[PDB]
Amino acid sequence: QPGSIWLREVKARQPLSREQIVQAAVRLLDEGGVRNLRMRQLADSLNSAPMSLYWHVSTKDDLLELAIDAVFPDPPSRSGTGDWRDDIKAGATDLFEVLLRHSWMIELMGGHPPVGPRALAHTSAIIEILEQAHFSPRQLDSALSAIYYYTVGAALSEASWQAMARQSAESEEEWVSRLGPYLGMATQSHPASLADYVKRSASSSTGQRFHDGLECMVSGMG
Amino acid sequence: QPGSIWLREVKARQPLSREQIVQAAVRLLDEGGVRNLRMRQLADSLNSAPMSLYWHVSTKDDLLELAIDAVFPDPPSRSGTGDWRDDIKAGATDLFEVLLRHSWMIELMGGHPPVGPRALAHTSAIIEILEQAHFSPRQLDSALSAIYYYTVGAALSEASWQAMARQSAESEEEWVSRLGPYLGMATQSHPASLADYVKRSASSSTGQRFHDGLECMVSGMG
Numbered sequence: 376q377p378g379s380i381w382l383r384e385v386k387a388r389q390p391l392s393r394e395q396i397v398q399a400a401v402r403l404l405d406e407g408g409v410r411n412l413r414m415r416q417l418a419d420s421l422n423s424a425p426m427s428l429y430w431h432v433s434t435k436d437d438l439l440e441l442a443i444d445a446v447f448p449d450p451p452s453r454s455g456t457g458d459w460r461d462d463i464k465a466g467a468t469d470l471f472e473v474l475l476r477h478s479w480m481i482e483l484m485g486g487h488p489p490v491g492p493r494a495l496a497h498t499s500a501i502i503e504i505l506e507q508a509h510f511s512p513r514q515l516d517s518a519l520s521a522i523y524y525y526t527v528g529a530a531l532s533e534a535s536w537q538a539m540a541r542q543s544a545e546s547e548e549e550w551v552s553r554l555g556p557y558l559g560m561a562t563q564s565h566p567a568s569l570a571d572y573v574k575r576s577a578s579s580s581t582g583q584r585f586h587d588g589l590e591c592m593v594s595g596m597g
Numbered sequence: 598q599p600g601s602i603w604l605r606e607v608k609a610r611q612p613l614s615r616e617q618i619v620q621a622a623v624r625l626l627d628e629g630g631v632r633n634l635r636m637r638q639l640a641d642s643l644n645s646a647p648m649s650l651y652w653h654v655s656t657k658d659d660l661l662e663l664a665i666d667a668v669f670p671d672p673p674s675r676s677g678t679g680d681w682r683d684d685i686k687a688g689a690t691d692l693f694e695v696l697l698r699h700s701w702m703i704e705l706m707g708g709h710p711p712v713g714p715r716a717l718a719h720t721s722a723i724i725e726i727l728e729q730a731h732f733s734p735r736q737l738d739s740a741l742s743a744i745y746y747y748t749v750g751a752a753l754s755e756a757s758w759q760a761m762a763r764q765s766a767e768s769e770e771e772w773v774s775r776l777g778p779y780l781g782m783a784t785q786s787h788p789a790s791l792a793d794y795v796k797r798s799a800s801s802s803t804g805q806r807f808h809d810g811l812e813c814m815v816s817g818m819g
């Protein structure tokens with residue numbers, strides 16, 4: 376309320392834990408993205424004033440990095456199937472599903488390298504899966520980049536699609552149908568394989584798209 | 598200037614071409630991203646009023662989709678090496694470099710499926726490269742998703758890194774050095790392979806990261 380600064384002249388800390396703050400920041404991020412994270416509103420959600428936050432972080436950017444690590448998946452459960460490909464796919468899939476659930480993190484990782492404890496443990500597990508499969512260092516690094524950059528690109532694309540699909544309320548089949556008048560005309564300038572791809576796309580879904588691409592990619596490594 | 602609406606009472610179209618508008622929109626997008634694209638400022642950059650724009654598009658969203666297609670790369674030059682892998686890599690690399698140069702498009706594609714003419718031709722060329730390599734339809738679709746989702750994720754991550762690197766003026770080697778005090782402590786909770794990966798990362802670069810991951814990924818297809 377206006378004038379409280381003057382009342383302070385005639386004479387209130389609210390200690391918080393960092394963990395409690397980060398959990399509250401994840402909730403605000405999940406609700407409205409990086410723009411929905413304002414420090415004063417975060418402090419309000421914890422019944423506190425902004426000073427309570429800055430005992431623990433210097434800036435909002437610090438808090439974004441803590442939030443990124445907080446939601447990183449546990450290392451994948453070693454599958455026992457004896458195929459390291461199954462373990463790689465579990466680890467990538469776990470990360471994919473986290474990214475879809477917390478899509479604000481996707482764009483942040485490239486400019487805020489994830490090296491917090493949960494990210495280090497997950498990455499260490501992927502690295503060990505590949506080493507125990509006798510990848511040399513250069514091959515390991517290449518395969519790791521393929522797996523992670525595939526997963527990030529898939530998450531970005533599918534999260535963007537899902538957000539638009541929610542708004543417009545439109546499935547893949549419905550979108551192909553709505554665009555059919557254009558697509559029928561435009562694909563006639565190219566060989567049959569293009570229209571055929573577009574037809575098949577009407578029956579695809581997020582989980583299958585991600586899984587099939589991941590399977591394909593990992594199939595041939597080694 | 599204020600009051601011009603009243604002067605209109607006592608008595609000016611500026612025809613533009615759609616192509617001219619789209620080129621000007623790409624320039625504004627390249628300068629400042631999707632937020633730097635305001636219709637009035639776009640019209641100002643063309644010495645026109647907003648009405649000139651809306652003869653050609655209904656909304657700014659239409660203009661974003663035209664801009665996405667306008668910058669799509671030409672289909673890759675068939676390499677003649679007789680290895681379809683070389684042609685796939687040229688096509689993916691061309692798209693990667695476009696995405697880095699026009700990074701505003703990366704997040705838009707998932708919610709605005711690229712089906713304009715330039716995107717259709719590029720995609721048709723990738724599809725034909727794979728068919729002529731005797732991929733069946735399900736395998737073709739999987740490989741295509743792997744290639745495109747790898748390229749998008751790499752572009753997102755590397756563009757984010759480059760934007761942060763420009764600002765802070767910091768190389769990969771310098772970043773590993775600045776974080777070394779933390780990383781030395783944090784990687785001691787895990788096997789040697791983790792610290793070794795981090796050390797190797799100091800000598801990586803955008804072009805090599807992208808190429809090595811792409812090579813690795815395509816190596817094993819078939």
Ligand SMILES: CCC[C@H]1C[C@@H]2CC[C@@H](O2)[C@H](C)C(=O)O[C@@H]([C@H](C)[C@H]2CC[C@@H](C[C@@H](CCC)N(C)C)O2)[C@H](C)[C@@H]2CC[C@@H](O2)[C@@H](C)C(=O)O1
Binds near residue numbers: 485
């Ligand atoms: C910071 C300077 C070096 C850096 C610069 C490149 C530009 C952009 C890219 O990193 C981003 C920052 C990024 O990390 O993407 C990761 C991945 C998506 C995320 C998710 C797991 C997490 C693991 C950690 C490592 C834990 C020990 N991260 C730092 C490698 O990272 C993904 C594996 C990419 C591909 C290869 C590259 O990382 C390696 C060589 C690297 O670290 O390159």
Ligand SMILES: CCC[C@H]1C[C@@H]2CC[C@@H](O2)[C@H](C)C(=O)O[C@@H]([C@H](C)[C@H]2CC[C@@H](C[C@@H](CCC)N(C)C)O2)[C@H](C)[C@@H]2CC[C@@H](O2)[C@@H](C)C(=O)O1
Binds near residue numbers: 550569577710720742
């Ligand atoms: C619109 C409903 C169907 C749709 C829903 C999924 C969710 C998100 C993803 O599309 C986005 C919209 C997207 O297009 O990503 C593409 C790719 C990155 C960009 C860049 C080249 C351009 C090619 C065109 C096709 C030209 C004939 N695009 C529409 C496939 O697209 C990439 C290949 C992904 C992986 C597979 C999937 O597309 C196919 C099956 C598809 O179209 O799924």
